[PDB]
Amino acid sequence: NFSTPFISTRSSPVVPWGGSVRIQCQAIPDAYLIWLMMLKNSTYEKRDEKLGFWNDTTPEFVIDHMDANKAGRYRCRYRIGFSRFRYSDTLELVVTGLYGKPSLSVDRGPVLMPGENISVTCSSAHIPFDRFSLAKEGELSLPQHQSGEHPANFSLGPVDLNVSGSYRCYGWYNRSPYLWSFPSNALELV
């Protein structure tokens, strides 16, 4: 068996509704045709279509003016020869700026030396979000931490500096996993 090509979003994969990101696939260089899909309702459908070979780089897409339309499961499609069709493992995108900014806060100071713990409490008092996800800047993926209890109890354990920088937190509902709240207030952990 095989791996199947990779799917990356070189810039953090969550964007303000109307945001722009630089999505990227792997490059089967014996495949002239490459199709970005969004697995939408029982199926998958063509959004963008980049033809050609890549005996150099890997293929990038760009989603600009990020829509509620543009959020969901994204997958690459490779066409080799006249019958070979190779997929890619799935990626998802999600928008921000929809519901209302939650607010987050600390139990200790903004520069906790991590030998001991820090929990962040994130919640909204007037917007009954199904779940909350705590979003670090930079790191190019769906958040490390997500919960669905009435206070967002996200501690960090004994931190270490690859857990540092700027942090925020987003709301989330049941059937809009692709649609998230506004960005909250920022946490400059150092």
Binding site: Y32, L51, G52, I80, F82
Partner: protein, 207 residues
């Protein structure tokens, strides 16, 4: 009256997913009684079409059978037979994926030295040469984006005066602005052809 049969088009074969193939009977001021019979049966069913009132007294009538994308690629000989609302003897044609091939040789060639000096618009050329059936597809690319067909001009395939092996040739021109060329971004020409193993084949250009 005459009958002709039309192969699937590389356009629909490579950039698409619905090769039709067309058997069209031409002329005889007929009610288009007709009736068409085809080779790969059952699988998909054949469809007749409107008596597209061909000029003069022909009134041509056509047939397609959709979905025949896979039997073309496994060679398999296709037949069409029509017995028409006139008289005599029914007419029949047959084709298949052509035997002998000959991969294209593709060459993207530079703007004129004397034209690029006069920094305005200049000419990229693309040359498909010595290949199998005349049917080809040439698509241009800027950076890594397919330009709409309307931005570049492509001539058709024509037999070249060849020594022995009867081979075809095609040319294409993309006229572009000089600032793009001296700037440094990348253009490409790509040729798709029945023979070619990877379907299309890309060759690029810098300066």
């Amino acid at each position: 009256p005459r009958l002709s049969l039309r192969r699937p088009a590389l356009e629909d074969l490579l950039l698409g997913s619905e090769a039709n193939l067309t058997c069209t009977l031409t002329g005889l001021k007929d009610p288009s009684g007709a009736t068409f019979t085809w080779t790969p049966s059952s699988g998909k069913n054949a469809v007749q079409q409107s008596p597209k009132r061909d000029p003069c007294g022909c009134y041509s009538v056509s047939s397609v059978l959709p979905g025949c994308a896979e039997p073309w690629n496994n060679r398999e000989t296709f037949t069409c037979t029509a017995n028409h609302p006139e008289l005599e003897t029914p007419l029949t044609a047959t084709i298949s994926k052509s035997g002998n091939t000959f991969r294209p040789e593709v060459h993207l060639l530079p703007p004129p030295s004397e034209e690029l000096a006069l920094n305005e618009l200049v000419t990229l050329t693309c040359l498909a040469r010595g290949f199998s059936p005349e049917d080809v597809l040439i698509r241009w690319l800027k950076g890594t984006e397919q330009l709409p067909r309307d931005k570049y001009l492509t001539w058709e395939s024509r037999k070249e005066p060849s020594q022995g092996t009867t081979t075809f040739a095609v040319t294409s021109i993309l006229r572009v602005a000089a600032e793009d060329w001296k700037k440094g971004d990348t253009f490409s020409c790509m040729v798709g052809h029945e023979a070619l193993p990877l379907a299309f084949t890309q060759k690029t250009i810098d300066r």
